[PDB]
């Protein structure tokens, strides 16, 4: 009982771009937005998220730990101290711990990208929220409704349990 549509960038036969469909999904949020993302520097999508939070929507954002400073650098340039917005919680996720042949311990990355709105609709795919995905790259997403959404909801809760408050904060 799952329906899935595809969208591409650059766009193919469909009316809206991937970025226009992201904005739509955020503006249609009534209760909760859950986002997992590797790099987030797109100002227009950030402005939609902040506008949702001001109307009372709870916003939970999980960013790859190694790329977090790109997000922070964006929010400060826009004159926003994001840590002051009580309806938004931003936390970081690490990849696996591993040991290099020089013996230093490192961690890798969270390679996972999805937007989950009101525990009811998902956009999943290879599009990251940065300028290079508008101008440079080819990407694709699924728009998902029905039973599969429940599995994205479980996985979000599992990453949220693992996630940490960012060290800058």
Ligand X SMILES: CCOC(=O)c1cn[nH]c1
State the residues that interact with a second copy by CB under 8 A: 2, 4, 6, 8, 10, 93, 95-96, 98, 106-113, 126-127, 132-133, 135-140, 148, 151, 155
Name which of 45 and 115 has its Cβ closer to ligand X.
115
Binds ligand X by CB under 6 A, chosen from 11, 83, 153, 166? 153
Q: Estimate the crossing angle of helix 43-54 against helix 68-77, to 10 degrees.
A: 70
Q: How far is the CB of 126 from ligand X (least distance, A)?
A: 20
Helix, strand, or coil here: 104?
Answer: coil
Name which of 14 and 30 has its Cβ closer to a second copy.
14
Which of the choices a second copy, ligand X, none does residue 107 contact, using the CB cut-off of 5 to 8 A by kind? Answer: a second copy
Contact assessment for residue 11 and residue 134, using Cβ atoms and an 8 Å cutoff: no
Q: Which of 3, 2, 14 is nearest to 140 (CA)?
A: 14
Q: How far is the CB of 156 from ligand X (least distance, A)?
A: 5
Site for ligand X in 11-70 (CB under 6 A): 32, 34, 60
- The rounded distance, in Å, linking the Cα atoms of 110 and 156 is 13
Instruction: Count CA atoms within 13 Å of residue 28 on its CB side.
Output: 14
Q: Which of 5, 2, 161 is nearest to 91 (CA)?
A: 161
Q: Which residues contact 51 (CB under 8 A, 6 or more apart)?
A: 27
Which of the choices a second copy, ligand X, none does residue 137 contact, using the CB cut-off of 5 to 8 A by kind? Answer: a second copy
Contact assessment for residue 57 and residue 26, using Cβ atoms and an 8 Å cutoff: no
Site size for ligand X, by CB under 6 A? 9
Name which of 114 and 133 has its Cβ closer to ligand X.
114
Q: Which residues bind ligand X (CB under 6 A)?
A: 32, 34, 60, 116, 119, 153, 156-157, 160
């Amino acid at each position: 009982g799952t329906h899935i549509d595809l969208l591409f960038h650059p766009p193919r036969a469909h009316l809206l771009t991937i970025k226009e469909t992201i904005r739509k999904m955020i503006k249609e949020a009534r209760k909760v937005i859950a986002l997992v993302m590797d790099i987030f520097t797109d100002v227009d999508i950030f402005k939609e998220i902040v506008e949702a939070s001001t109307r009372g929507v709870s916003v939970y954002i999980l960013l790859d730990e190694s790329n977090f400073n790109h997000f922070l650098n964006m929010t400060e340039k826009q004159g926003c101290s994001v840590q002051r917005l009580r309806n938004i919680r931003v936390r970081t996720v690490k990849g696996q711990d591993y040991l290099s042949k020089t013996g230093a311990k490192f961690h890798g990355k969270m390679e996972q990208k999805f937007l989950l709105v009101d525990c009811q609709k998902v956009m999943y795919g290879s599009y990251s929220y940065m300028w290079s995905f508008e101008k440079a790259h080819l990407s694709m997403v699924q728009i998902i409704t029905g039973q599969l959404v429940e599995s994205f909801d479980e996985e979000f809760r599992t990453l949220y349990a693992r996630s940490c408050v960012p060290s800058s904060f």
